[PDB]
Design an enzyme around this catalytic site. Sequence first.
Site, PDB file in Angstrom:
ATOM      1  N   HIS A  44       5.177 -14.692 -14.569  1.00  0.00           N
ATOM      2  CA  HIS A  44       5.123 -14.470 -13.141  1.00  0.00           C
ATOM      3  C   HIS A  44       4.680 -15.730 -12.442  1.00  0.00           C
ATOM      4  O   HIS A  44       3.515 -16.087 -12.622  1.00  0.00           O
ATOM      5  CB  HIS A  44       4.134 -13.377 -12.808  1.00  0.00           C
ATOM      6  CG  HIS A  44       4.388 -12.149 -13.632  1.00  0.00           C
ATOM      7  ND1 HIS A  44       3.904 -11.955 -14.842  1.00  0.00           N
ATOM      8  CD2 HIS A  44       5.204 -11.114 -13.309  1.00  0.00           C
ATOM      9  CE1 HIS A  44       4.419 -10.832 -15.285  1.00  0.00           C
ATOM     10  NE2 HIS A  44       5.196 -10.342 -14.357  1.00  0.00           N
ATOM     11  N   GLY A  98      -4.250  -6.834 -17.041  1.00  0.00           N
ATOM     12  CA  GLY A  98      -2.812  -6.708 -17.093  1.00  0.00           C
ATOM     13  C   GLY A  98      -2.532  -5.351 -16.465  1.00  0.00           C
ATOM     14  O   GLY A  98      -1.822  -5.360 -15.458  1.00  0.00           O
ATOM     15  N   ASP A 100      -2.355  -6.383  -4.311  1.00  0.00           N
ATOM     16  CA  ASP A 100      -2.101  -5.165  -3.559  1.00  0.00           C
ATOM     17  C   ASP A 100      -2.075  -4.019  -4.576  1.00  0.00           C
ATOM     18  O   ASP A 100      -2.671  -2.950  -4.385  1.00  0.00           O
ATOM     19  CB  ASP A 100      -0.759  -5.267  -2.762  1.00  0.00           C
ATOM     20  CG  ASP A 100      -0.624  -6.484  -1.818  1.00  0.00           C
ATOM     21  OD1 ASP A 100      -1.223  -6.527  -0.728  1.00  0.00           O
ATOM     22  OD2 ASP A 100       0.096  -7.419  -2.200  1.00  0.00           O
ATOM     23  N   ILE A 156       3.608  -8.230  -0.359  1.00  0.00           N
ATOM     24  CA  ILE A 156       4.675  -8.083  -1.332  1.00  0.00           C
ATOM     25  C   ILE A 156       4.034  -7.538  -2.575  1.00  0.00           C
ATOM     26  O   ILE A 156       2.848  -7.863  -2.963  1.00  0.00           O
ATOM     27  CB  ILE A 156       5.320  -9.468  -1.652  1.00  0.00           C
ATOM     28  CG1 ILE A 156       6.409  -9.749  -0.633  1.00  0.00           C
ATOM     29  CG2 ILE A 156       5.935  -9.528  -3.037  1.00  0.00           C
ATOM     30  CD1 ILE A 156       7.795  -9.132  -0.887  1.00  0.00           C
ATOM     31  N   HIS A 158       8.227 -12.841  -7.901  1.00  0.00           N
ATOM     32  CA  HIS A 158       7.024 -12.274  -8.477  1.00  0.00           C
ATOM     33  C   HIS A 158       7.042 -12.320 -10.000  1.00  0.00           C
ATOM     34  O   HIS A 158       5.954 -12.392 -10.586  1.00  0.00           O
ATOM     35  CB  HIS A 158       6.851 -10.839  -7.970  1.00  0.00           C
ATOM     36  CG  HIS A 158       5.932  -9.981  -8.832  1.00  0.00           C
ATOM     37  ND1 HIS A 158       4.615  -9.888  -8.782  1.00  0.00           N
ATOM     38  CD2 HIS A 158       6.364  -9.190  -9.881  1.00  0.00           C
ATOM     39  CE1 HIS A 158       4.231  -9.092  -9.748  1.00  0.00           C
ATOM     40  NE2 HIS A 158       5.290  -8.673 -10.410  1.00  0.00           N
ATOM     41  N   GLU A 211     -14.492   9.227 -13.560  1.00  0.00           N
ATOM     42  CA  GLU A 211     -14.392   8.954 -14.981  1.00  0.00           C
ATOM     43  C   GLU A 211     -13.753   7.639 -15.279  1.00  0.00           C
ATOM     44  O   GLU A 211     -14.332   6.826 -16.003  1.00  0.00           O
ATOM     45  CB  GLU A 211     -13.581   9.975 -15.765  1.00  0.00           C
ATOM     46  CG  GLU A 211     -14.292  11.320 -15.847  1.00  0.00           C
ATOM     47  CD  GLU A 211     -14.181  12.163 -14.565  1.00  0.00           C
ATOM     48  OE1 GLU A 211     -13.104  12.094 -13.955  1.00  0.00           O
ATOM     49  OE2 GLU A 211     -15.141  12.881 -14.201  1.00  0.00           O
ATOM     50  N   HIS A 258     -10.318  23.315 -18.876  1.00  0.00           N
ATOM     51  CA  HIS A 258     -11.494  22.601 -19.353  1.00  0.00           C
ATOM     52  C   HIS A 258     -11.601  22.640 -20.882  1.00  0.00           C
ATOM     53  O   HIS A 258     -12.712  22.436 -21.370  1.00  0.00           O
ATOM     54  CB  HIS A 258     -12.726  23.236 -18.752  1.00  0.00           C
ATOM     55  CG  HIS A 258     -12.775  23.117 -17.242  1.00  0.00           C
ATOM     56  ND1 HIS A 258     -11.842  23.469 -16.343  1.00  0.00           N
ATOM     57  CD2 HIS A 258     -13.829  22.525 -16.578  1.00  0.00           C
ATOM     58  CE1 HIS A 258     -12.295  23.094 -15.179  1.00  0.00           C
ATOM     59  NE2 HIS A 258     -13.485  22.524 -15.319  1.00  0.00           N
TER      60      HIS A 258
HETATM   61  C1  LIG Z   1      -1.409   0.038 -14.070  1.00  0.00           C
HETATM   62  C2  LIG Z   1      -0.229  -0.832 -13.950  1.00  0.00           C
HETATM   63  C3  LIG Z   1       1.049  -0.233 -13.627  1.00  0.00           C
HETATM   64  C4  LIG Z   1       2.224  -1.096 -13.522  1.00  0.00           C
HETATM   65  C5  LIG Z   1       2.108  -2.407 -13.716  1.00  0.00           C
HETATM   66  C6  LIG Z   1       3.271  -3.292 -13.406  1.00  0.00           C
HETATM   67  N1  LIG Z   1       2.936  -4.177 -12.224  1.00  0.00           N
HETATM   68  C7  LIG Z   1       2.501  -5.425 -12.357  1.00  0.00           C
HETATM   69  S1  LIG Z   1       2.115  -6.161 -10.906  1.00  0.00           S
HETATM   70  C8  LIG Z   1       2.581  -4.750 -10.084  1.00  0.00           C
HETATM   71  C9  LIG Z   1       2.517  -4.711  -8.585  1.00  0.00           C
HETATM   72  C10 LIG Z   1       2.775  -6.079  -8.040  1.00  0.00           C
HETATM   73  O1  LIG Z   1       1.883  -6.153  -6.936  1.00  0.00           O
HETATM   74  P1  LIG Z   1       0.766  -7.256  -6.831  1.00  0.00           P
HETATM   75  O2  LIG Z   1      -0.550  -6.946  -7.447  1.00  0.00           O
HETATM   76  O3  LIG Z   1       0.680  -7.318  -5.326  1.00  0.00           O
HETATM   77  O4  LIG Z   1       1.431  -8.590  -7.336  1.00  0.00           O
HETATM   78  P2  LIG Z   1       1.979  -9.834  -6.573  1.00  0.00           P
HETATM   79  O5  LIG Z   1       1.578 -10.937  -7.414  1.00  0.00           O
HETATM   80  O6  LIG Z   1       1.327  -9.761  -5.222  1.00  0.00           O
HETATM   81  O7  LIG Z   1       3.431  -9.642  -6.477  1.00  0.00           O
HETATM   82  C11 LIG Z   1       3.030  -3.783 -10.957  1.00  0.00           C
HETATM   83  C12 LIG Z   1       3.547  -2.414 -10.597  1.00  0.00           C
HETATM   84  C13 LIG Z   1       0.887  -2.873 -14.309  1.00  0.00           C
HETATM   85  N2  LIG Z   1       0.718  -4.150 -14.645  1.00  0.00           N
HETATM   86  N3  LIG Z   1      -0.262  -2.117 -14.328  1.00  0.00           N
HETATM   87  C1  LIG Z   2     -11.765  15.847 -13.448  1.00  0.00           C
HETATM   88  C2  LIG Z   2     -12.953  16.704 -13.427  1.00  0.00           C
HETATM   89  C3  LIG Z   2     -14.171  16.217 -14.019  1.00  0.00           C
HETATM   90  C4  LIG Z   2     -15.342  17.081 -13.964  1.00  0.00           C
HETATM   91  C5  LIG Z   2     -15.283  18.294 -13.367  1.00  0.00           C
HETATM   92  C6  LIG Z   2     -16.490  19.217 -13.472  1.00  0.00           C
HETATM   93  N1  LIG Z   2     -17.132  19.628 -12.169  1.00  0.00           N
HETATM   94  C7  LIG Z   2     -16.647  20.611 -11.412  1.00  0.00           C
HETATM   95  S1  LIG Z   2     -17.272  20.591  -9.865  1.00  0.00           S
HETATM   96  C8  LIG Z   2     -18.157  19.180 -10.223  1.00  0.00           C
HETATM   97  C9  LIG Z   2     -18.603  18.265  -9.110  1.00  0.00           C
HETATM   98  C10 LIG Z   2     -19.351  18.904  -7.978  1.00  0.00           C
HETATM   99  O1  LIG Z   2     -18.261  19.436  -7.247  1.00  0.00           O
HETATM  100  P1  LIG Z   2     -18.106  19.725  -5.707  1.00  0.00           P
HETATM  101  O2  LIG Z   2     -16.626  19.610  -5.489  1.00  0.00           O
HETATM  102  O3  LIG Z   2     -18.989  18.950  -4.774  1.00  0.00           O
HETATM  103  O4  LIG Z   2     -18.494  21.235  -5.427  1.00  0.00           O
HETATM  104  P2  LIG Z   2     -19.640  22.017  -4.703  1.00  0.00           P
HETATM  105  O5  LIG Z   2     -19.109  23.343  -5.011  1.00  0.00           O
HETATM  106  O6  LIG Z   2     -19.610  21.373  -3.355  1.00  0.00           O
HETATM  107  O7  LIG Z   2     -20.872  21.664  -5.409  1.00  0.00           O
HETATM  108  C11 LIG Z   2     -18.077  18.886 -11.567  1.00  0.00           C
HETATM  109  C12 LIG Z   2     -18.514  17.590 -12.198  1.00  0.00           C
HETATM  110  C13 LIG Z   2     -13.987  18.751 -12.965  1.00  0.00           C
HETATM  111  N2  LIG Z   2     -13.763  19.972 -12.624  1.00  0.00           N
HETATM  112  N3  LIG Z   2     -12.864  17.990 -13.082  1.00  0.00           N
HETATM  113 CA   LIG Z   3       1.271  -8.825  -3.841  1.00  0.00          CA
END
Ligand SMILES: Cc1ccc(C[n+]2csc(CCOP(=O)(O)OP(=O)([O-])O)c2C)c(N)n1
Ligand SMILES: Cc1ccc(C[n+]2csc(CCOP(=O)(O)OP(=O)([O-])O)c2C)c(N)n1
Ligand SMILES: [Ca+2]
EC number: 2.2.1.1
Lengths: 678, 678
Positions: A28, A114, A155, A187, A261, A416, A479
Amino acid sequence: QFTDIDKLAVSTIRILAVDTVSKANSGHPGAPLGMAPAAHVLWSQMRMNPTNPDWINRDRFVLSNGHAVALLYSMLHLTGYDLSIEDLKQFRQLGSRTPGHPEFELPGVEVTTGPLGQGISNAVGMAMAQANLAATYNKPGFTLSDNYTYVFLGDGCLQEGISSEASSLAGHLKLGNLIAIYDDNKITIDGATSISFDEDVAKRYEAYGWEVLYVENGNEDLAGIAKAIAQAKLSKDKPTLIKMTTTIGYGSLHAGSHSVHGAPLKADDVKQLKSKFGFNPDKSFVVPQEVYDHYQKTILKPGVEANNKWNKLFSEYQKKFPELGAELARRLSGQLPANWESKLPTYTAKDSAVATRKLSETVLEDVYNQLPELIGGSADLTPSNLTRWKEALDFQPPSSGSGNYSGRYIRYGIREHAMGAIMNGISAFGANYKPYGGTFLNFVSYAAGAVRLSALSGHPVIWVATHDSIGVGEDGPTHQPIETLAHFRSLPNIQVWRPADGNEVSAAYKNSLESKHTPSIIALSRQNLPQLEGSSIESASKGGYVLQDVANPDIILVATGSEVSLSVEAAKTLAAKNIKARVVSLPDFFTFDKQPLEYRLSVLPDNVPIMSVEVLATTCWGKYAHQSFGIDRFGASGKAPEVFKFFGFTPEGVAERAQKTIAFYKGDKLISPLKKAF
Amino acid sequence: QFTDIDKLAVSTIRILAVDTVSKANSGHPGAPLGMAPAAHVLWSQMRMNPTNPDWINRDRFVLSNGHAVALLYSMLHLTGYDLSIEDLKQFRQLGSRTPGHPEFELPGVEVTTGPLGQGISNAVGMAMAQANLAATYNKPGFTLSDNYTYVFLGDGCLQEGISSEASSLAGHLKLGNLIAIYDDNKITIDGATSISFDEDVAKRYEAYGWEVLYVENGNEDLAGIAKAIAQAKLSKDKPTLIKMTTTIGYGSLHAGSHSVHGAPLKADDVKQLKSKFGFNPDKSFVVPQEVYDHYQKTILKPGVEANNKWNKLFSEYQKKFPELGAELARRLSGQLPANWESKLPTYTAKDSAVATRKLSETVLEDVYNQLPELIGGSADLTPSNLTRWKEALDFQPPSSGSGNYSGRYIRYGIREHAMGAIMNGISAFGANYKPYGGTFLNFVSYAAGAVRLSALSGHPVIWVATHDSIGVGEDGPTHQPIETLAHFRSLPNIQVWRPADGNEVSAAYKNSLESKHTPSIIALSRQNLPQLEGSSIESASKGGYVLQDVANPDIILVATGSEVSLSVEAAKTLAAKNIKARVVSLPDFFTFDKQPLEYRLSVLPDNVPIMSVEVLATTCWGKYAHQSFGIDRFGASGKAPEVFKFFGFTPEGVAERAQKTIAFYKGDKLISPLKKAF
Ligand SMILES: Cc1ccc(C[n+]2csc(CCOP(=O)(O)OP(=O)([O-])O)c2C)c(N)n1
Ligand SMILES: Cc1ccc(C[n+]2csc(CCOP(=O)(O)OP(=O)([O-])O)c2C)c(N)n1
Ligand SMILES: [Ca+2]
Ligand SMILES: [Ca+2]
């Protein structure tokens, strides 16, 4: 004050990277051509020793937008790291030191990037880690830690959720020394950003609590870029994003296009680039002597001089504060306290049944006082994961009044994937940081981009994954892990411990914490599990061992986690109908496969049918057993004994299945599955 | 305008949802109590028919904080959906219609939720499919399509990066009809939100292009909440977010604490709550008849009238616009066009080598006009994944100048998890929507939270995952999938097709599109594969077939994708030194596993060694093969043929291992791996 040599430095960085990509005929060119002025202004002002890439108080730079490697490879070469023009002339080629995206393993490359979103998220670990170190060991007179963490991002990294998770948390913790420079080039791959990404970044980031500065001519304004970095350094209690607009492929005959790019600029485009920049059209990988000499006075020689002062102040510190000095000296050598293992718990089958999860908590209770470099947390599940010791103090900004930066308990919120990568960044900092983070094993799958990279780089982070099956119960199938372990056991270089009792939990902690190059997942039960007759730290440390032997067995049963006890019970039942069954406990595939073959083949011998028992998918088990009793469908919502009962995992359900397996095979000769032809 | 009965209905939901948790002695009471007023008020103005939960033009409700499900079951009961007090009295119990988190499959439940951040991102898909139905079928005088999408959500959903990817794309797309109410209760599991979440959500939301309204008193301001939803419906070009503040567990003695997040309330506290609201502390699941009367009037009878006028109108519409009326009726009965399958490309071995990636693109170009329900997209890799037919228009706000909502190609940005939950939302909308999204096979992993739910709920979404192996080449290890397929092959209910040539890419597409309940991942080559002699759509549609057979094979070679041509060449080597190999092409584990055992055993019999050949993880292959040649370590940056040779995957290197497999087993009788003992 930037002179004509600063403008000579910037053309050599741009054309060197251009050259690198064009010889590889791959790579690139676009972001390197636009980011080169910012790389020059930043590097020139970072405090770093190229001859000692591991000094703990070095400024750290992360290229989050890893696809722009040739910019990092040119900088590394020019400012005097061990990397040469021949290395560069082999960018992206089999075996070379210069692969197509940066890797932790090379010197002066701080984490591998990457996958987008990873670098910026790692840098937040790095800054948390510095905040903690500085708080723990700095004393008035001895400021041993005070470095910055510079991040470069695109971006792409601003679109991925992980960096919004990370940025939200960085903003909360007030991480003043984290400075990100955003290449606002309008871009990405499909075309112009307005097709899918037209949000107001600056307002989004100020909302998180970050300071945002702007540079509008990032293609030519070294003073602008320079003053922004300097103002950012004054941001003592806000992280800073600097949004610097640039043109992708600056200088190129197709700059601003998205065609620049990820393909080499064509020959004639590179030649007009050389002429226009005052370089020779028919010469490649050319570095003016003036550039080496520049960076030699600007960076290498003050860096060495700064590193060297650090060493003398660290030695006066070891005189002044002998025991804290002794501590940091050890962490810096990367050894763990001698014989720490003696604080790990042991149990007999006489003590109570306890969920592997409350045993996990007791290890942390017993070891935190011994290992100051152990920093833990949870992605909002602290009372479910039982992941915080009683005398802990939270890692927080001191204003919070709930904790401070010396604290060792990070609250991660429901983030997470962020915690996976922040854990990798705390570990990649150094000073022997042992990071762990808890959640429910089912949601570690959210973190999977970050966890594959703990494995690719070898970052020994520890995941405390509690609630490891249908014994969760009533929360139901959303879960209840089915495929989770199977997945992560197909991933090279990661330990997936699934302990069965107290001694096996201590062995999972021991091997995980003593690891230098493998991450770990400790999969743990919600529910009570009995202490086993004959488990031992020593034996479970081999990852697989005979738990209950008999002479001349009819079947070998192999179980992991909560199924080892169920298998011992099914084993009593098989005995009363006069069947001798050996019970094997395999706490970790990885560790057991690290054993010498002759060990492995004593645990899983020839000529005996071998059956596996584990309430998750049977797909990873063919390598250890002939027939498998597992669950290849999603779970269910109900009381946990009933879900076990509903799928067959009862002592008489396993025994029935061992009997049908002895019967299926009587008369045949059986080869162990461990044995391979080639 | 609300009256006493509206306040009796809100207390009835509060206490009915409390009696449901306490009965199970498991569950989350708090968000039910605090959120009961917005539920009352919102549902009372939704247009829906309890009698017909599949009415295409119903207002759609998603509860993204899915753990609050006691409340969704109270409202489905009270409004006339098929769920009784009895069903409520077996909440969380094995086999009841009341799981501890909502599942798609229940009447009135739109999507499976409970994983955080998944609901909201699915609601964005459902609003995208509504906007696309409306712009494709709505006519002058025939507004067949105009519903609202409503979402309840909490702090947890806002901290997951997938809802930030989703909200960004939603703000860009200017989805006016999507209205989100957020439970700003200031509590999550660990304690107060300030311990780790104190960003300015509102300013962050305005940054994406969303309108944010504020209801300072969610606890009792019925009038305010109604005002907010009314106001929200006026802004046709901003999605709206209502920050509504509540006390978690309102009316409980411990209201406002994380204690009431996920524990049944204490009996004495349930008694006082009931007295506090005028109910009898000694009775359970009491529903005042006035409440039943009230919803029959305000929601069910209106609802049933709306559904009836809609029908009358859709009948006029098919008189007025025949084609369009026949097409939408077909899509509404879930049938594909008849004989669409005949528009799929077939090839012979005399045709030319093409990467299965290009071949995917020609299927898409040959069928998009046959299937108007096909809506495609990529996560910023359109020119790599080759996901866009030529004549395509993009799905954009009309205001963009780059498309309008009648477009069928979406530019998701570098948002893979969010593409996942959004394709699940589009599919979940109806009208036989067939969403597909492209990305790199190594980064589908980013989207695992969503891909799991595609399979659990059974939404038949397609992921077009190009660049399947070390044939990716020079970008190396971070971009080469090692474990990905063995991960999704351990997930219940998902096709993972890895086609070797045109006829197999066609079969992959046919089987994936006809699927009504199982998602699919098609892994595709960056590099050129040739057209095999022996493939066909028919054979390839069974998932495992014999590509070339011999009388009495010394060995069977089972392979997938780019390794089937390799194995046909290795088989030419072996032949020359008179070993007879049968070559079996296995394009999908799922589809094959679904065949009659008789078929499978004629493909993989007893008494022949079977060696598998695939350049990714070997762990999963124990179910069909005796020996497996594959890669259980990360890749290498290098030109692709060079990386294949490095790893041993050459004709002679495969031939060689087949020879050592024959010699290892000579004189053992062999049992096909398919034969299970119980
Ligand atoms: C998680 C993830 C998904 C997909 C790609 C493929 N990928 C590399 S750069 C890019 C987006 C290009 O945007 P950029 O960060 O703005 O790069 P630039 O240098 O500005 O063109 C994507 C989709 C990856 N490297 N990582
Ligand atoms: C991806 C993901 C990770 C962990 C949980 C477990 N979990 C359920 S609710 C909660 C976070 C507190 O949730 P809330 O949306 O603020 O609910 P409230 O009822 O306002 O206390 C946790 C860690 C989940 N359901 N899904
Ligand atoms: Ca870019
Ligand atoms: Ca909350």
